[PDB]
Tab-separated table of C-alpha atoms in Angstrom:
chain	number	residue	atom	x	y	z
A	397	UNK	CA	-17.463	0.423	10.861
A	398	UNK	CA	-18.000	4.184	11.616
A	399	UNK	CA	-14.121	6.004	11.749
A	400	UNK	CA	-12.676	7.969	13.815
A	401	UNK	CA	-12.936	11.089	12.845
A	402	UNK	CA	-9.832	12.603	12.698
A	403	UNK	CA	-8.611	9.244	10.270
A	404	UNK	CA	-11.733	10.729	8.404
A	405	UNK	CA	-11.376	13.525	7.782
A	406	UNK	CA	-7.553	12.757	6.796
A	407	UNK	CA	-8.137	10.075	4.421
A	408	UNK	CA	-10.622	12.253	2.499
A	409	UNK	CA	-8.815	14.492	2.547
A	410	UNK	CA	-5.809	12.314	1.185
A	411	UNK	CA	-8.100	11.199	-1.686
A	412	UNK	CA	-9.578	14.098	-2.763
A	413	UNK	CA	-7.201	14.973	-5.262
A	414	UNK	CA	-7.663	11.510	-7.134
A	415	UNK	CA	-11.772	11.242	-7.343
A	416	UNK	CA	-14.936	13.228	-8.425
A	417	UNK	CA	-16.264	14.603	-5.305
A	418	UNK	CA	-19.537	12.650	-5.649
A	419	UNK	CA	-17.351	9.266	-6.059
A	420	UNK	CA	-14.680	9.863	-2.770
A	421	UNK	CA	-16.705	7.595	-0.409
A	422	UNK	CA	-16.769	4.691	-2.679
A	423	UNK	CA	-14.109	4.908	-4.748
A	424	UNK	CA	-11.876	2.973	-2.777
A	425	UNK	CA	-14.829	0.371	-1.858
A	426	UNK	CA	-16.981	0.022	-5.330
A	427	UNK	CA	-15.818	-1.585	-8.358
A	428	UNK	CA	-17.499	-1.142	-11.615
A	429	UNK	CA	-16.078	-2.240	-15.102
A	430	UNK	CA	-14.460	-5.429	-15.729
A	431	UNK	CA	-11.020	-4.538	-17.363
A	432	UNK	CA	-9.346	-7.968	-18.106
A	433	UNK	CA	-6.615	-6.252	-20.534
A	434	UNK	CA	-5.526	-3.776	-17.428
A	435	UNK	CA	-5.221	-6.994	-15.178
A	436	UNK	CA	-3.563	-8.493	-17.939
A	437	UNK	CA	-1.358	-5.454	-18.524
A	438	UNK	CA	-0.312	-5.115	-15.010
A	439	UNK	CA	0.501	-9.058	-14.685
A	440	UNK	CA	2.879	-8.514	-17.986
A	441	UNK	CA	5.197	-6.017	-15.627
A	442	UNK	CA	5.529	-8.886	-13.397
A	443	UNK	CA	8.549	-10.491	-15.491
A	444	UNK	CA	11.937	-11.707	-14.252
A	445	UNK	CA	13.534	-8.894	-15.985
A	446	UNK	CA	12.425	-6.061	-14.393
A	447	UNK	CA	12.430	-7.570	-11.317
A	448	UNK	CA	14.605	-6.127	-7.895
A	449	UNK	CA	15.370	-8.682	-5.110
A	450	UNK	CA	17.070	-7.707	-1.087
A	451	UNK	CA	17.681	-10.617	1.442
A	452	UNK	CA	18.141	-9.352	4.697
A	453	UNK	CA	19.639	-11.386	7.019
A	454	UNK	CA	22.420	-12.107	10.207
A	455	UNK	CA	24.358	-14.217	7.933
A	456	UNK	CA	25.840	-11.364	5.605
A	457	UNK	CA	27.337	-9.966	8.885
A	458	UNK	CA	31.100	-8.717	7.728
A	459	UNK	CA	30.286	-10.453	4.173
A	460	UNK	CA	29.670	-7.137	2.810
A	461	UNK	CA	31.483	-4.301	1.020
A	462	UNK	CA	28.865	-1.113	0.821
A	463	UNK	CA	27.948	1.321	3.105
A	464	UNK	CA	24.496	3.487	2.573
A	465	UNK	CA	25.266	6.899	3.336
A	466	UNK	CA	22.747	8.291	5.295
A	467	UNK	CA	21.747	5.327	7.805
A	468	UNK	CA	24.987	3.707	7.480
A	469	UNK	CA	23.358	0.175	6.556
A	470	UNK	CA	26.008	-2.255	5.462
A	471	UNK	CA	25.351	-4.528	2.349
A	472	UNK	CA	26.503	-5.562	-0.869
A	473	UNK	CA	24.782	-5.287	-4.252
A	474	UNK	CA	24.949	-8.567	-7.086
A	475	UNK	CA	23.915	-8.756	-10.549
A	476	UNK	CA	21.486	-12.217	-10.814
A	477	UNK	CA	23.052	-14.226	-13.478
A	478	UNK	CA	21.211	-14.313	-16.529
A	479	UNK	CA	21.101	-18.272	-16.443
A	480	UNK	CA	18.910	-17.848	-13.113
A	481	UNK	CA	16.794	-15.353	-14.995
A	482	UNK	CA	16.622	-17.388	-18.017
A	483	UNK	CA	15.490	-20.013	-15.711
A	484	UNK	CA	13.027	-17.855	-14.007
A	485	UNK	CA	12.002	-16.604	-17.515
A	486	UNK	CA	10.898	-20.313	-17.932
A	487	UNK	CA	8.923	-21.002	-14.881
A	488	UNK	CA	6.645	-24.359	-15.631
A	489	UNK	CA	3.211	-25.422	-14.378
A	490	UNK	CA	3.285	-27.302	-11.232
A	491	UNK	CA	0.149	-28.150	-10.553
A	492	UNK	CA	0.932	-27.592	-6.885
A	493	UNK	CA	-0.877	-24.378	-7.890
A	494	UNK	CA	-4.242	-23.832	-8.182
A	495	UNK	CA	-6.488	-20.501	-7.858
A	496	UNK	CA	-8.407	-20.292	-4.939
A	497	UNK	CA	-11.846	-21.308	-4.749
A	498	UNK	CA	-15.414	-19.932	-4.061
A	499	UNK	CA	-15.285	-18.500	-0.587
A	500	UNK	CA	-18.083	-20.630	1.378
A	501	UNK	CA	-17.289	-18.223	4.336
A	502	UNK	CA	-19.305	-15.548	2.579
A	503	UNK	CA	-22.498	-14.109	4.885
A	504	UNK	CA	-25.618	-13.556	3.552
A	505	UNK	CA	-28.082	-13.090	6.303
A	506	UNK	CA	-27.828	-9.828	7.815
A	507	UNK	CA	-31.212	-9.816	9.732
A	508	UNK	CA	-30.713	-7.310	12.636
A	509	UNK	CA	-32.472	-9.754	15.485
A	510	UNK	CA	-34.843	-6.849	17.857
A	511	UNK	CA	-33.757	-5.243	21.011
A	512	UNK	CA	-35.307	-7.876	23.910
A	513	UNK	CA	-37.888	-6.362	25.860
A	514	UNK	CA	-35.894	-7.074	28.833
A	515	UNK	CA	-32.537	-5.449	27.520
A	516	UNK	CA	-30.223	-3.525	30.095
A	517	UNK	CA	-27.787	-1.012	29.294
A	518	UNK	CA	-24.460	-2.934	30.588
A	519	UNK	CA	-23.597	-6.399	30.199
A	520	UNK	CA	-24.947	-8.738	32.302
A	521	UNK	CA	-24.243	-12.159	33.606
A	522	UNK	CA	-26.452	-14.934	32.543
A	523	UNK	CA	-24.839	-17.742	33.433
A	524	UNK	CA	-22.528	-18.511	36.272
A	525	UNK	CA	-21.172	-21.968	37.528
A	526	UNK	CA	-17.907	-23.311	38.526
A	527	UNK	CA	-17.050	-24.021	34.782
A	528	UNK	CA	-17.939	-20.992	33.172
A	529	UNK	CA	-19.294	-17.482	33.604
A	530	UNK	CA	-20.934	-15.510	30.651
A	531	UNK	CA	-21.558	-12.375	30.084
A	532	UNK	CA	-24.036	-10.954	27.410
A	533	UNK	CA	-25.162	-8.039	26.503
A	534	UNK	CA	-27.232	-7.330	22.524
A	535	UNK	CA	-26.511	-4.364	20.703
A	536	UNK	CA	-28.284	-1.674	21.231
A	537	UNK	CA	-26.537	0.738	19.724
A	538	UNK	CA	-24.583	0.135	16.600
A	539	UNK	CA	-27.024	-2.134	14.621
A	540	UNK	CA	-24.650	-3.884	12.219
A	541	UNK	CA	-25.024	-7.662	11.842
A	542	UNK	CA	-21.930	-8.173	13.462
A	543	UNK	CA	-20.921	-9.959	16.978
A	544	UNK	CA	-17.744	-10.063	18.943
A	545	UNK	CA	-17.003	-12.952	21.300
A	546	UNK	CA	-14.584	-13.132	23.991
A	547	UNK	CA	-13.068	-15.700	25.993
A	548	UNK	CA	-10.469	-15.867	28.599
A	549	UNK	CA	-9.377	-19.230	29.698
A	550	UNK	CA	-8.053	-19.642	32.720
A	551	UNK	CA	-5.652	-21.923	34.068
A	552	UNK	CA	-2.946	-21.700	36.822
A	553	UNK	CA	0.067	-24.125	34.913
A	554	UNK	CA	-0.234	-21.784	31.149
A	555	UNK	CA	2.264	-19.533	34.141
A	556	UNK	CA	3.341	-21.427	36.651
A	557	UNK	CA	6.975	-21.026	35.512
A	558	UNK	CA	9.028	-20.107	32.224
A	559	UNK	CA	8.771	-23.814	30.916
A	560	UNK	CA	5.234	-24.037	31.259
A	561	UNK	CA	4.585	-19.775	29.657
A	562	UNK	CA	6.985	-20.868	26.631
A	563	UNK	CA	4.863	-24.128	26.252
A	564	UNK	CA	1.574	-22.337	26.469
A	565	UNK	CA	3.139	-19.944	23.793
A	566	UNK	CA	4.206	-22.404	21.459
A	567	UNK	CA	0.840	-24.285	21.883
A	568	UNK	CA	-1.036	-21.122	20.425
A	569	UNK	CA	1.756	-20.074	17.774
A	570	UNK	CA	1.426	-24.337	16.570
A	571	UNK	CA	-2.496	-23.984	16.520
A	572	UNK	CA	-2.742	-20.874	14.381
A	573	UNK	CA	-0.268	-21.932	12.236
A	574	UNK	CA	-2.407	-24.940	11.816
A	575	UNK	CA	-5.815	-23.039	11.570
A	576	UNK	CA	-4.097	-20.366	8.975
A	577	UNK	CA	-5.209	-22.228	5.651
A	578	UNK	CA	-8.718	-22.471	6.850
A	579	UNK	CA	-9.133	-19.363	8.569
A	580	UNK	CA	-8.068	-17.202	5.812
A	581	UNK	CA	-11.379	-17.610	3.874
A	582	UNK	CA	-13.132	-16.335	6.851
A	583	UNK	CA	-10.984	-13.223	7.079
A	584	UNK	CA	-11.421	-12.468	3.911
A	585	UNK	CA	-15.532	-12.569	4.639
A	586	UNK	CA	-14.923	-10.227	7.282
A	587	UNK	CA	-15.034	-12.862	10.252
A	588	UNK	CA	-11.867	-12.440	12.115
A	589	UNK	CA	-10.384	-13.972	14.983
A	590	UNK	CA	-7.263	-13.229	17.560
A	591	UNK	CA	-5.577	-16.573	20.063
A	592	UNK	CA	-2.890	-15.307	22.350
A	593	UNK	CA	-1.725	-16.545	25.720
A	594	UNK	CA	-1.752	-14.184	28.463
B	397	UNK	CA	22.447	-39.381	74.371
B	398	UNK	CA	22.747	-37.123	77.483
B	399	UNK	CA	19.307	-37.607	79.281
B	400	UNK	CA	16.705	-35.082	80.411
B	401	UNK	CA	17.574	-35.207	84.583
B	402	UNK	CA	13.783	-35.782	85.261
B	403	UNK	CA	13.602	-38.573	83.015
B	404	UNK	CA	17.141	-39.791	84.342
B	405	UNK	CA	15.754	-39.929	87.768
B	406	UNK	CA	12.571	-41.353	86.998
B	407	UNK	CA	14.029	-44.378	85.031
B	408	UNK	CA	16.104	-45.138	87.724
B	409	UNK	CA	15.595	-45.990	91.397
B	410	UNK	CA	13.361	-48.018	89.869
B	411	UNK	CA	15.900	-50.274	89.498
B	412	UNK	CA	18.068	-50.057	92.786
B	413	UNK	CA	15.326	-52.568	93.937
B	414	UNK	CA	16.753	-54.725	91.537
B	415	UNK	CA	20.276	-54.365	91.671
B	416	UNK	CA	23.446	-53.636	93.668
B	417	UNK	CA	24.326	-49.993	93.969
B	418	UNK	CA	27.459	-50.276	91.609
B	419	UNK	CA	25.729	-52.090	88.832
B	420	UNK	CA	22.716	-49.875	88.709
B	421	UNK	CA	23.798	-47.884	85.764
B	422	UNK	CA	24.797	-50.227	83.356
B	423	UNK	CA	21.913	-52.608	84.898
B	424	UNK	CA	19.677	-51.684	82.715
B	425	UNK	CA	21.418	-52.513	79.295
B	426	UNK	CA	24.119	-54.681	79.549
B	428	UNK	CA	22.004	-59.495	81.340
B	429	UNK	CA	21.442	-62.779	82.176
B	430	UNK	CA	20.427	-65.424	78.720
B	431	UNK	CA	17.191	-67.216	80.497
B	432	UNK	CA	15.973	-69.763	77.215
B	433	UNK	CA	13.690	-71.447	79.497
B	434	UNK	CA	11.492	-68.080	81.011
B	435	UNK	CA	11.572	-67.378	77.068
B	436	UNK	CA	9.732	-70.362	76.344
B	437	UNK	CA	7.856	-70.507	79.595
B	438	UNK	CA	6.113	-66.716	77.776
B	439	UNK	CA	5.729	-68.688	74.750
B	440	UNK	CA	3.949	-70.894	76.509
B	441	UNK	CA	1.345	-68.191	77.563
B	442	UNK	CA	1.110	-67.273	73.937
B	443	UNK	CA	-1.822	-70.089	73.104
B	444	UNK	CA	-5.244	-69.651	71.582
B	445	UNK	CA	-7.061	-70.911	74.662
B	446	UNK	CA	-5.707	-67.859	76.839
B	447	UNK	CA	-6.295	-64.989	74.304
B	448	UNK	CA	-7.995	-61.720	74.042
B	449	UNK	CA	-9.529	-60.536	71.226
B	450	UNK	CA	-11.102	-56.629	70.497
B	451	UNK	CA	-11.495	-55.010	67.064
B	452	UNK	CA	-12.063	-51.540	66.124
B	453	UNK	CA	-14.174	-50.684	63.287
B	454	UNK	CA	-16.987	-48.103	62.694
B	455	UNK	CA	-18.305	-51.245	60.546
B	456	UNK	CA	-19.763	-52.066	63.851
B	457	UNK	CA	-22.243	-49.507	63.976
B	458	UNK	CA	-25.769	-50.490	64.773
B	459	UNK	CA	-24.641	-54.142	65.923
B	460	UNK	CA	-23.694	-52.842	69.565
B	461	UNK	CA	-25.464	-53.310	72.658
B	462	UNK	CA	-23.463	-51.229	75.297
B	468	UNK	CA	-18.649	-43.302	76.442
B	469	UNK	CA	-17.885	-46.486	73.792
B	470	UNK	CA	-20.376	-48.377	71.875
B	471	UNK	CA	-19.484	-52.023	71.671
B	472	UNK	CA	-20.186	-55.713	71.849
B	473	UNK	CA	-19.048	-58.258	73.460
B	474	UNK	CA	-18.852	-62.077	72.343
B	475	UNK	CA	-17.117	-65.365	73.137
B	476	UNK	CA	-15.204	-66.773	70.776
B	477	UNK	CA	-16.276	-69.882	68.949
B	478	UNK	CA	-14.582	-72.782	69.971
B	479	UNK	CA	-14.228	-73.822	66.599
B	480	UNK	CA	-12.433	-70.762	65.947
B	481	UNK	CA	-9.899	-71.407	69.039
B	482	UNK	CA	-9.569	-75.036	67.007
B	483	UNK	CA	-8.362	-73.306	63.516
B	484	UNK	CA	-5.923	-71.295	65.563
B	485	UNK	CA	-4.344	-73.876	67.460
B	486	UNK	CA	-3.690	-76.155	64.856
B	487	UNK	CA	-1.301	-73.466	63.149
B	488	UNK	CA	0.784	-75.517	60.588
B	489	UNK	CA	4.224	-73.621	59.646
B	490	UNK	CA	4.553	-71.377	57.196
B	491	UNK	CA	7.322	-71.129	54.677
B	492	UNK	CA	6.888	-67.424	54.207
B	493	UNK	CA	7.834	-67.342	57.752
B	494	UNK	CA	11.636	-66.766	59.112
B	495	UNK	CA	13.584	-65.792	61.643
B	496	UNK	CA	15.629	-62.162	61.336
B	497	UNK	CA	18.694	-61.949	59.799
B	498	UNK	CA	21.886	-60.601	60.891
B	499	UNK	CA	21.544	-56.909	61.182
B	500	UNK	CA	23.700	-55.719	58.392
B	501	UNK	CA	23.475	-51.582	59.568
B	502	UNK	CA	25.100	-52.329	63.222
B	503	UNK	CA	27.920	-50.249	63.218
B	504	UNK	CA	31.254	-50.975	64.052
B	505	UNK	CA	32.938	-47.711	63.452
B	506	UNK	CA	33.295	-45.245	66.181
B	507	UNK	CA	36.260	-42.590	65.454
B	508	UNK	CA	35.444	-39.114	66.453
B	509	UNK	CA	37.198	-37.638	63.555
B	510	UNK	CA	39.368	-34.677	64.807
B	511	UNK	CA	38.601	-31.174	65.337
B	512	UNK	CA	39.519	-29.409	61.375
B	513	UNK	CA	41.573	-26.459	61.716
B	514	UNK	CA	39.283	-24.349	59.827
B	515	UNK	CA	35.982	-25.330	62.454
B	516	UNK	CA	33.315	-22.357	63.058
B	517	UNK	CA	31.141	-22.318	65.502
B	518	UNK	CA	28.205	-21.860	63.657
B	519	UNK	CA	27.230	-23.080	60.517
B	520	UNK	CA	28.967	-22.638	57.525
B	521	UNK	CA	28.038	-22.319	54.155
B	522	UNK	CA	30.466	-24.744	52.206
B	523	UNK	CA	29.196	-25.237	48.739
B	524	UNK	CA	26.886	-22.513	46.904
B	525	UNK	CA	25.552	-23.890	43.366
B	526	UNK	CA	22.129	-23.029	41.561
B	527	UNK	CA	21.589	-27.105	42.324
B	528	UNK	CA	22.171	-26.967	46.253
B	529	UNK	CA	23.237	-24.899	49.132
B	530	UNK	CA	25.279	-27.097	51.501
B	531	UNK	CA	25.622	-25.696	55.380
B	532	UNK	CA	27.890	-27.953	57.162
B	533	UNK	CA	28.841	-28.308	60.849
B	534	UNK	CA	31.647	-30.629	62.913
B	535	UNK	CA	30.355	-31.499	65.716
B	536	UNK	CA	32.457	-29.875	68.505
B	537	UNK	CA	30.565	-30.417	71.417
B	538	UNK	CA	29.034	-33.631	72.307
B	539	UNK	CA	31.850	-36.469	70.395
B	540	UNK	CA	29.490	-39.060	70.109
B	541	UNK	CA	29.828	-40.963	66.812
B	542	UNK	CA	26.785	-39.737	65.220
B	543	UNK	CA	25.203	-37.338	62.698
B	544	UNK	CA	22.119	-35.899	61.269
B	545	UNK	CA	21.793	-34.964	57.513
B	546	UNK	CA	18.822	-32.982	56.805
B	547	UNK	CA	17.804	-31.774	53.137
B	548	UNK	CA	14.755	-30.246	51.414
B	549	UNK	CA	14.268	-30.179	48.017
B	550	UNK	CA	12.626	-27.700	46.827
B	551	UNK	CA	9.315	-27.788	43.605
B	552	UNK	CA	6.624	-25.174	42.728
B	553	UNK	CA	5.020	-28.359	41.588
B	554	UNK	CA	4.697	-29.817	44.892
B	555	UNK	CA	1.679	-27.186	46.202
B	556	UNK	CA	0.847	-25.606	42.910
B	557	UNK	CA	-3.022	-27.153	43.063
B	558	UNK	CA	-4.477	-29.253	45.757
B	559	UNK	CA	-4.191	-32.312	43.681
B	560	UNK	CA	-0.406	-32.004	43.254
B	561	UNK	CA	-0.167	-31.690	46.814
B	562	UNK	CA	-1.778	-34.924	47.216
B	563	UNK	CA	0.256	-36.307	44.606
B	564	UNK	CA	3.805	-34.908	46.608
B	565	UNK	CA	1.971	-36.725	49.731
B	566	UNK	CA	0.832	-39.696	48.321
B	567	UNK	CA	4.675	-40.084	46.619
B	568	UNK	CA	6.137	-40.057	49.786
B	569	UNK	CA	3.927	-42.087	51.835
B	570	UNK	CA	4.671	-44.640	48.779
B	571	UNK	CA	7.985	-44.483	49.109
B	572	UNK	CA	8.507	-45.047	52.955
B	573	UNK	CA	5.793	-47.875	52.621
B	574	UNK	CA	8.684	-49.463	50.730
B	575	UNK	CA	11.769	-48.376	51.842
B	576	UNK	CA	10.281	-49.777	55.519
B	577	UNK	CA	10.977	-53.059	55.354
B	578	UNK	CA	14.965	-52.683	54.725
B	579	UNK	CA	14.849	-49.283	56.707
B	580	UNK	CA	13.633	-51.433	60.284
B	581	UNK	CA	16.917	-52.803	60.579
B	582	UNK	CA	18.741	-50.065	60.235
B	583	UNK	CA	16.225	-48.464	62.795
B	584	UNK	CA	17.081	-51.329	65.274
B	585	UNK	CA	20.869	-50.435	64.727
B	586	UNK	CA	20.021	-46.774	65.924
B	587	UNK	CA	19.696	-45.345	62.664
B	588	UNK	CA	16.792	-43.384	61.274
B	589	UNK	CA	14.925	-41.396	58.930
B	590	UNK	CA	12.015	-39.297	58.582
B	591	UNK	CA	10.507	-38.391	55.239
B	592	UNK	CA	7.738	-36.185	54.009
B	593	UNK	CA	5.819	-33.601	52.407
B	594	UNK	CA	5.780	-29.668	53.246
């Protein structure tokens, strides 16, 4: 997607001092070499003994005995115990883990269908019954093989009163949950998609 | 219940035909047991002197004669079926009338009586506006409520849910209400 130009300009200009000025477009997007023994490197830092851990939570609430200085956040700071280190130090297979596999989601026809001879420059409405009423307009300007689709469902008990609003709520929160595992391959592939009630 | 004095008048004097003078107001409720003019109306109530008309827009097309309608004798036959009426065990007389009342007090006058209205009892449940009677001392009241749902008229089908619920409901409740309608008791029940 084409930026905004002021985040343009300020990103580049951000990265500039890191890339040769004929790589700065690309260098965040393009990778080139392989480098297995930097992966590899990078994963060895990831050890139980360099590692820093912060709960936050309600529950410490007058448990504590520090005071940050300058925000005046209230905490208390614990050395882990070497025996849950040495532990950690020993993490086993499960099994319950496996890498992910080959994303399925991934487009690969990107055929720009042609401006209809009929086209109009708003959207119009090209189908209208009790049901449903759509409204369509094709790109005409942009010309990325992309699409967004809207819907708004109505229906007069999702707010009726606060039982019914929390229930509609709780009805979308319980389906994305539900869709998350799924969806995520898709999101990845640059196919995104947003539920709320309203 | 005091009467309207137009419909006082108009009742009676149609009775001082009837009855002496002095007995002309309680003439009317209070007379004589008459078992054999009972009968002798039973006795008119036979298939062979009957009357029979029925309403139905299933008629339609099979009238000759502003009213559209036919007219017919009744077969013979038929009369026969009816007058040979066996009894009926589903059949009995009433029962004592359980809701006639036999308390009358006119409870007294409390010390703390408004003359309008007051609100008594003020709950997120139910608001409660009570009144002693302080007028008319007959032993009587009327207790009206509503309840109150969003769900009642939220679509038109919940509204003709709410309706069809209370028609329901009276439909059986009116069998053991009639008695206690006799007994001057009553109720009225529905959907706003």
């Amino acid at each position: 997607d084409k930026e905004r130009p002021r985040g343009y300009t300020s990103k580049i200009a951000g990265i500039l001092h890191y890339y040769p000025l004929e790589e700065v477009l690309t260098a965040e997007y393009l990778l080139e070499e392989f480098r297995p023994d930097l992966i590899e490197m990078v994963l060895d830092k990831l050890r139980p003994e360099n590692v820093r851990v912060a709960i936050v939570s309600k529950s410490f609430e007058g448990k504590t005995d520090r005071t940050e200085e300058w925000y005046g956040t209230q905490y208390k700071q614990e050395a882990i115990p070497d025996e849950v280190i040495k532990k950690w130090q020993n993490a086993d297979l499960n099994g319950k883990f496996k890498l992910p596999t080959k994303n399925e989601f991934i487009p690969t026809n990107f055929e720009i269908l042609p401006l209809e001879k009929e086209a109009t420059p708003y959207p119009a409405l090209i189908k209208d019954t009790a049901m449903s009423k759509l409204w369509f307009k094709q790109d005409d300007k942009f010309f990325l093989p992309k699409a967004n689709l809207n819907f708004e469902f109505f229906s007069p008990f999702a707010y009726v009163d606060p039982l019914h609003s929390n229930m509609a709520y709780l009805y979308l929160e319980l389906l994305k949950d539900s869709l998350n595992e799924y969806a995520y391959a898709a999101e990845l592939a640059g196919l995104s998609y947003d539920l709320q009630n309203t």
